[PDB]
Design a protein around this ligand. Sequence first.
Ligand SMILES: CC1=C(/C=C/C(C)=C/C=C/C(C)=C/C(=O)Nc2ccc(O)cc2)C(C)(C)CCC1
Length: 174
Amino acid sequence: ERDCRVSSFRVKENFDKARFAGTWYAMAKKDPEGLFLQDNIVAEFSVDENGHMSATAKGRVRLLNNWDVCADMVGTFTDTEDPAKFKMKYWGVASFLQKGNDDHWIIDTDYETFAVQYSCRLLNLDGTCADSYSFVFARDPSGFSPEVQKIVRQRQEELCLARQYRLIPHNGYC
Ligand SMILES: CC1=C(/C=C/C(C)=C/C=C/C(C)=C/C(=O)Nc2ccc(O)cc2)C(C)(C)CCC1
């Protein structure tokens, strides 16, 4: 019954970039293929006077060589015709960090407690997603009550990613 076509996914209605600024802690995540961010991830969103949006992220990375380091990443977002879907350019302070450009959709958020984000880096010929990433973010590193949980569990199912997220740890590494 429920479709897994990226184009049919709902996103956050009348998304407000400014109530979205501030510190977001990653509590859970579904990784994409390849190299990614491990744990201890925290993002910081800002908006300038022109209504832009940028962000900086920190997290631990395990190099393919099993190096334990802490990435400082930067991303600039470009607006689209849908206030909740952005094109994100990103890079790291250290050149060895991945550079790239990903779709950045705001699935759901209450601006005050939680956020559900998602990116599909590759579409299968059917319109479903072949390689995706999604973050569950919290304003507070102690979490969400049981009722906010229930809402996040439902959006996850809606993105056809239910059961695929792992809890992310925060231990002060970076
Ligand atoms: C900017 C940031 C976003 C996305 C960041 C991404 C998705 C970072 C990826 C970094 C990686 C994947 C580094 C890596 O490239 N890790 C390694 C591993 C091993 C190695 O040898 C080199 C690098 C997002 C959504 C959080 C919030 C908006 C700000």
